[PDB]
Amino acid sequence: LSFLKHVQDCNTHDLSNFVRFVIEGRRVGWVRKALAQRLKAHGRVFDVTRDAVLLSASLRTPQSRTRAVADVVDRLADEGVVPAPRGELYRVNQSWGEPTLMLLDRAVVPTFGVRAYGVHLNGYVGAGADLHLWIGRRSPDKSVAPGKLDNMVAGGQPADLSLRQNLIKECAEEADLPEALARQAIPVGAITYCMESPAGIKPDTLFLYDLALPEDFRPHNTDGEMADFMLWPAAKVVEAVRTTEAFKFNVNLTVIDFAIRHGLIDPDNEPDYQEILAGLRG
Amino acid sequence: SLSFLKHVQDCNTHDLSNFVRFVIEGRRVGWVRKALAQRLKAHGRVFDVTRDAVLLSASLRTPQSRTRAVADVVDRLADEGVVPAPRGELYRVNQSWGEPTLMLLDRAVVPTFGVRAYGVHLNGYVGAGADLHLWIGRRSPDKSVAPGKLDNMVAGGQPADLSLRQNLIKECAEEADLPEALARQAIPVGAITYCMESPAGIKPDTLFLYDLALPEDFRPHNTDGEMADFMLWPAAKVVEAVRTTEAFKFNVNLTVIDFAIRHGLIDPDNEPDYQEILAGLRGR
CATH class of the missing domain: 3.30.750.160 (Transcription Regulator spoIIAA)
Structure with missing residues (x-):
């Protein structure tokens, strides 16, 4: 629903x-x-x-x-x-x-x-009704959400880096993404939530980035934080979040936000549109 | 004032x-x-x-x-x-x-x-009296709990599907490269119970305790890498490290105090709070 x-x-x-x-x-x-x-x-x-x-x-x-x-x-x-x-x-x-x-x-x-910050990247190919998202599967060794589905790149924000510097670093370590491409990612807003x-x-703020990738780019799990990656139609990602608990808890929010910004969720028929938007802002 | x-x-x-x-x-x-x-x-x-x-x-x-x-x-x-x-x-x-x-x-x-948790802890030692030495493990930095802290030579949580002795044997091999024939010579010596937030x-935990007098020529090796390394220390040095420092994993302090009591290293004629220490080692 x-x-x-x-x-x-x-x-x-x-x-x-x-x-x-x-x-x-x-x-x-x-x-x-x-x-x-x-x-x-x-x-x-x-x-x-x-x-x-x-x-x-x-x-x-x-x-x-x-x-x-x-x-x-x-x-x-x-x-x-x-x-x-x-x-x-x-x-x-x-x-x-x-x-x-x-x-x-x-x-x-x-x-x-204490408020915590992080950066999350939506790595995708294609356009319009034909968007495909790279989804990571977290290592079984992760203390939080082992084996769960994730953004192509995501990480907590250290004190000593800007958002962009951390994004570049996480992109390199998690997904073997070249700095040239990490630098092309655009900031597209933020999500805030507060949970026990x-x-x-955890009163957390996730700064969100979009990157349209080359067709021949394949993410590779350099530092082993991700077990693997999969390229899925955007509708599959959106429906998986709607109907399963396959994604890491806060990655659900990043998918919903992506779906809103890319018109995959429509206010004429989406149950609870306004309450969803309100809650993504905490 | 530790x-x-x-x-x-x-x-x-x-x-x-x-x-x-x-x-x-x-x-x-x-x-x-x-x-x-x-x-x-x-x-x-x-x-x-x-x-x-x-x-x-x-x-x-x-x-x-x-x-x-x-x-x-x-x-x-x-x-x-x-x-x-x-x-x-x-x-x-x-x-x-x-x-x-x-x-x-x-x-x-x-x-x-x-829920109450169980575990087994082994005191691996050599010598007697003034020459009593304990093998201490140093935990790997990758441990979720107490990384890099000092530990018993062998210790682990108790799985549902094993006896205490079976788990002790398995942990002895995996953690310290201590073979079954020697691990089976370990004798049970009591238990510690505590309850902490x-x-x-x-965590309302019970630690089942075992002692093993090891051969002079035994050396533990960190087969599964749960331990970073091992050290052989005079028993008194271990006891004083627990008395005055936070070098040991939190509940391993309790196993050292118990060992000191059972091996006559502390004496009710002069150790402060002897009865209260004993009471708290059976704490619920």
């Missing part, structure tokens, strides 16, 4: 068991109440009240906040309380383009309910 | 207030977060959800029917980003180790349902 359930799935959250995470007056995240109690034991770094986890006012540069929090995080992971840092840092801000207030390891970003995830809250 | 006691306390820190009991045929076998219970409610043919409990449907009369029903729910919740993805290792669901297996559950979602749920 409708794409609405996929959109609602990605926007399902209950903030009642969480407290605001605040830096210099600005809410940057959400921390579970029990976890907030564990942070309270590190009172040189966190000031914890009934309504908030506040970073210490003694940490007033991004760099000193980054370092102090990283040390507490390392300790908490040692104790089995939060996921182990893996070394990729994310920026902590109130929205994209606002100042970076500190950096936090990607592995604990949902643990602090296994280890916290 | 200490033996703080490790024990860390492993027994939990708050059940945001959770409801997970019940099969009147027996509590887990704990499910309240928001997740709301998600489970949509699967009314498998779960009955009230204000106080998630009950598996009484229509699921056999362990096989329960396992299949919940496996499908887990599949779809994981597809939706709600729970961790199943990875293929199944664990037994019971009220305690002796009790009947009520169903099976993928290891990846065992903490999501707050973890990133994705609740």
